[PDB]
Amino acid sequence: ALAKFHKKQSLTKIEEQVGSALVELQNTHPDLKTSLESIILTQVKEFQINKTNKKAKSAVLIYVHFQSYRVLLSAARKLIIELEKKLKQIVFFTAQRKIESKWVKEHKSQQRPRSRCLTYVYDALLDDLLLPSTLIGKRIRARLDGTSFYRIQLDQNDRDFLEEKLDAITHIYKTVTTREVTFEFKEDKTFHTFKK
RNA sequence: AUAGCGUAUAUUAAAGUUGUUGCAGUUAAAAAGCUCGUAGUUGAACUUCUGUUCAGGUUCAUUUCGAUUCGUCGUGUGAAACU
Numbered sequence: 070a071l072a073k074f075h076k077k078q079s080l081t082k083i084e085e086q087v088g089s090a091l092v093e094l095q096n097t098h099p100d101l102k103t104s105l106e107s108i109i110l111t112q113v114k115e116f117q118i119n120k121t122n123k124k125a126k127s128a129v130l131i132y133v134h135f136q137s138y139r140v141l142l143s144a145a146r147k148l149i150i151e152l153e154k155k156l157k158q159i160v161f162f163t164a165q166r167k168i169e170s171k172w173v174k175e176h177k178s179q180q181r182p183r184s185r186c187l188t189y190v191y192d193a194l195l196d197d198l199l200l201p202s203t204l205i206g207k208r209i210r211a212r213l214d215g216t217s218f219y220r221i222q223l224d225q226n227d228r229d230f231l232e233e234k235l236d237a238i239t240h241i242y243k244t245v246t247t248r249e250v251t252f253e254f255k256e257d258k259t260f261h262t263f264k265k
Numbered sequence: 266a267u268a269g270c271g272u273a274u275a276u277u278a279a280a281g282u283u284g285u286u287g288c289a290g291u292u293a294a295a296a297a298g299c300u301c302g303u304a305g306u307u308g309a310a311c312u313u314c315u316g317u318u319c320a321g322g323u324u325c326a327u328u329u330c331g332a333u334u335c336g337u338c339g340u341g342u343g344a345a346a347c348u
């Protein structure tokens with residue numbers, strides 16, 4: 070539907086499927102009705118995960134308007150499950166973040182809130198992708214020359230949902246951001262006082 | 266030392282013997298008996314990171330090319346970084 074979009078002009082074959090696909094789920098499943106009623110879309114981008122295997126395995130990332138970001142996270146799990154079943158493609162939800170300029174300030178009486186800065190915006194997606202579960206440890210490495218590798222620590226109990234998307238994420242990030250992102254699984258680090 | 270050479274006095278260096286650079290401070294001189302406290306001096310971390318490609322030189326490297334000589338240029342790569 071052009072309904073579930075903000076620009077409301079024209080959609081792309083991908084964006085279109087996503088629209089009806091969404092409208093589908095709120096009619097089909099009674100539970101996602103409430104949440105999906107709310108959800109609006111900003112834009113959707115498709116990315117090809119090209120591996121040396123000459124295999125074409127694509128997935129698509131969808132930009133949920135910030136207004137519905139709360140809601141999007143509220144049912145995030147179930148939503149992505151159905152969208153992947155109903156589109157046979159890998160699905161990722163992000164927030165539509167607007168980045169502010171560093172030196173291009175123009176409104177004398179306007180300060181650039183850190184909330185919308187490049188470090189913080191680009192760092193956002195990573196949380197968004199692995200979505201269902203947020204990371205435990207994040208790190209940076211400086212290869213001699215000057216590369217920066219982000220080996221990120223992911224929870225063990227989530228090996229399911231995250232192991233698969235794992236390659237897509239890497240590839241979407243390298244495209245949007247510019248950051249190489251390798252992951253590493255570590256058993257969760259429960260630190261409490263076991264007391265028998 | 267030598268048509269020059271002593272002497273007296275102030276002053277420079279030796280003086281890291283007045284010290285920003287660059288001193289010392291248990292016992293050699295030197296931490297105050299001890300706390301509060303405005304001047305003064307001193308202050309944590311975040312905000313385009315980054316990538317791709319083109320180009321100009323720069324350098325450096327060279328199982329290497331063309332020129333010249335009593336030591337330079339041009340060409341190619343890679344690389345870095347600049348721009």
Ligand SMILES: [Mg+2]
Nearest residue numbers: 266270271272
């Ligand atoms: Mg004498």
